[PDB]
Amino acid sequence: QYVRIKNWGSGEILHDTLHHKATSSCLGSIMNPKSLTRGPRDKPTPLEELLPHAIEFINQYYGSFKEAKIEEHLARLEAVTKEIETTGTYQLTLDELIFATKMAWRNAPRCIGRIQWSNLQVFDARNCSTAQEMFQHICRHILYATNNGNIRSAITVFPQRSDGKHDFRLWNSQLIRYAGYQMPDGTIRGDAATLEFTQLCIDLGWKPRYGRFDVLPLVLQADGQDPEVFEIPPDLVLEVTMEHPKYEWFQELGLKWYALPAVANMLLEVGGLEFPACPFNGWYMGTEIGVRDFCDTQRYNILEEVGRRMGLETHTLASLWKDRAVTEINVAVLHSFQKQNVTIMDHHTASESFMKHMQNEYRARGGCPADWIWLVPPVSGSITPVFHQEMLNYVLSPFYYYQIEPWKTHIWQ
Amino acid sequence: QYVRIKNWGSGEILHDTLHHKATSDSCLGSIMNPKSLTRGPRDKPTPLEELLPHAIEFINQYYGSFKEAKIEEHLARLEAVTKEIETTGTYQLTLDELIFATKMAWRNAPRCIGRIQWSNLQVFDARNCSTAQEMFQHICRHILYATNNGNIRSAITVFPQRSDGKHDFRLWNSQLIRYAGYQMPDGTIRGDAATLEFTQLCIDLGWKPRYGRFDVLPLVLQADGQDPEVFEIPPDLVLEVTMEHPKYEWFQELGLKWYALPAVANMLLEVGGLEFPACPFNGWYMGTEIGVRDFCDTQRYNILEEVGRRMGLETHTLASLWKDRAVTEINVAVLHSFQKQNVTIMDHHTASESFMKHMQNEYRARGGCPADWIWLVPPVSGSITPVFHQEMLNYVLSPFYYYQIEPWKTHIWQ
Ligand code: HEM
Ligand code: HEM
Ligand SMILES: C[C@H](O)[C@H](O)[C@H]1CNc2nc(N)[nH]c(=O)c2N1
Ligand SMILES: C[C@H](O)[C@H](O)[C@H]1CNc2nc(N)[nH]c(=O)c2N1
Ligand SMILES: NC(=[NH2+])NCCC[C@H](N)C(=O)O
Ligand SMILES: NC(=[NH2+])NCCC[C@H](N)C(=O)O
């Protein structure tokens, strides 16, 4: 047929026809491929595939530690095989889940902080059963993770998937996120990215405080239930007010950002089974906030105002005012986080560390799935070592898959 | 167990327990939306044994009308309908029958003062309609006709009757033209606060929130049984009157206006057993509706505060009767403004006097006249009006214009 291609700035969509007349087509540049998503269900994962997946995992698990528990290996193997063939699905040992989350992170080809893969905290919420109960696990998480600026990587694993109609899901893109409202005067306030998701919350009776930085409410769904709106306790949301170390007028911009980068809506797959709810977090890398969040035309879009107050030639592309501005916004972010004693890493050190990660990774297990397109910082790419490193992107297991935005695939009352 | 009482001002709800200790002698009279005045949903057609006598009764009403009855046709029609009823289930009215139906249903509406005009009505037959887009057109034809560039004309457009009860035509709007109400960011409320919930609805169905004080809401229509199709009204069709006082030049500074067309949308016409859940109709405004209710209710535009202020009255002293003074001026503003721009309207006094004449004609004629004193007495200057001093009985006849459960409460989502 054809291939759908989207421009994340315009939202403009294109359909490729020409690719057919191809030679005797890397999807690479595509953002949400079906090859990285793990969709809904109605029937539990059929045995023939669930079984070999599970066994693979357990052989991986028992393969890790020095001096293998040879007997326990077969014992666990046998036990699991029977455990599966009998009830259908199967439960992981706590220790196993730990290993899974760390390995799944180790296998996230679009993450640069993977050198930190072994340093993770797991919150076993597998026995959770209600939204009010989820909310509490989430708060425990945010709080643990925030740690008063000294950010700590953690993940909270909710009950696995059973049949398909009994899914635990966080509807948010990430734990903390600012609201975005299309205003009457034709304009747009706050984070333009979370526009649809914000309207959604408004529909579910959320109180729109109409601001640039209004933390979005938590939308959660347990077992198979309809989503429950939970306003996040403000004392839990640590923020950093943006201010330049030389441009005192920068503070006048009234900028700030949340210290916690916790991905919400992703799915953890392991040994065949999948957990559709498992928010996790690490810490920020300057460019994320400075370049992406602040400068994207699709997001906060500040660049022009920053180049303007900087005295640069805003009307001449060739002047490179954008390169000048953005760099200043980056130092602002790094500076502000640095000052208010909140963890963050610059793209340079981040890259240098990822490079050392790879060396350890190849020397260790033989490879390292990497998505060049993603791993190369959004600014000063070639100044970065990763830009000069060839790399292969490939899905392994366990893994963190994306998933169909819940509000689309859902049975209401 | 107990009775629910609502205060339409604060919107507060109360539960009456005491009424049980009542006597061996409980007027609901004060209640706005009783069940006795409503006619809800369905799942099955009208059981024949009922449908039949109602139909015959109706046909007997009709033919019993004309001077020198068409006895043969009377019998024939009875016979034909009886037949049609047993053959189809439901039955269809001769156009002239509908005409008579709508005029009587109006004539039987106890809460209307304009009823002396009961015989001067225009009926638009949209019974053969089948799509929302098609409704929309009939509606525009209606609005256009009614408006008549100021010389307002009373009319009603009758859509398809009820079949089973899951195949109903319904206008979700209170009335044809109606300003929107938005609960704004700064905690305030712009526009008509009465149309707040309904606005959000239009918003949810992807309506473009124009965020103003006078934004004419979109027609939310539903055909056969299919979901509501949102249709915005053509601004050229919506005639309005900008409010301005004949002496207080500062009154126009208030930026006030109001639509010229009072067309009730969501009511139901019952006749000879059948029922049309969609049949918008209109008369013309009566000053006090806009001047007192629309402009002065706490739950509506609520202007009284500043109309008094700008008039210079002692706004913080109830006993100064400033509210009495202010309102009266708002009323003349409205009457003046309508009169000025050649848009039909009637002051409450002349209206009441004419209604008194209506009764005299009505009793002498048929023997009664259903009246809801609570509704018929103007919201201001009650006793100055003849109707205040008039005792009246409030009873439901047939045909009739019943209220009906707000459709968004009882609807299917495919
Ligand atoms: C230790 C701190 C960490 C740093 C500095 C780091 C940094 C990054 C960066 C820069 C991105 C790009 C985000 C974007 O462009 O939207 C990213 C993506 C990602 N990270 Fe890491 N990360 C860290 C920890 C983690 C942890 C703890 C996990 C898993 C438990 C993880 C899982 C992922 C995944 C799955 C993505 C892909 C997100 C997506 O596809 O939208 N990261 N990370
Ligand atoms: C000729 C001009 C007419 C005038 C001056 C008039 C006036 C009024 C007034 C003052 C009310 C009270 C409205 C309110 O307080 O909400 C009312 C209610 C009503 N009118 Fe008349 N009307 C007229 C024509 C009509 C027509 C043409 C019909 C029907 C074909 C009609 C049917 C009704 C009904 C059923 C109500 C009750 C509304 C409700 O219960 O909410 N009116 N009218
Ligand atoms: C279209 C293109 O794939 C897309 O804009 C990319 C590129 N690389 C990225 N890299 C990271 N880390 N994060 C991103 O959002 C993106 N987006
Ligand atoms: C509670 C009370 O019945 C209610 O406020 C009434 C009284 N009479 C009325 N009379 C008219 N014409 N219109 C009304 O809305 C009302 N409201
Ligand atoms: N460092 C991370 N783990 N980031 C993941 C999500 C953060 C996201 N890029 C943001 O700017 O909000
Ligand atoms: N004259 C009428 N038919 N009025 C019926 C509805 C008008 C309504 N009372 C209003 O002020 O908008």
Side-chain angles (χ1 to χ4, degrees), chain B residues 175 178 258-259 262-264 282-286 289-290 294 300:
Chain B
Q175 45 193 302
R178 192 84 196 268
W258 197 263
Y259 46 92
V264 184
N282 74 271
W284 48 70
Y285 270 106
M286 190 216 242
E289 308 189 63
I290 309 165
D294 296 344
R300 299 299 285 301

Side-chain angles (χ1 to χ4, degrees), chain A residues 315-345:
Chain A
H315 303 261
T316 305
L317 267 328
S319 75
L320 308 200
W321 64 272
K322 297 192 170 182
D323 300 44
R324 218 100 74 151
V326 67
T327 294
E328 300 308 326
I329 302 178
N330 276 325
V331 273
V333 166
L334 268 62
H335 176 243
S336 301
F337 271 65
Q338 187 103 56
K339 202 165 184 174
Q340 294 162 62
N341 290 298
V342 177
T343 311
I344 194 170
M345 185 164 240

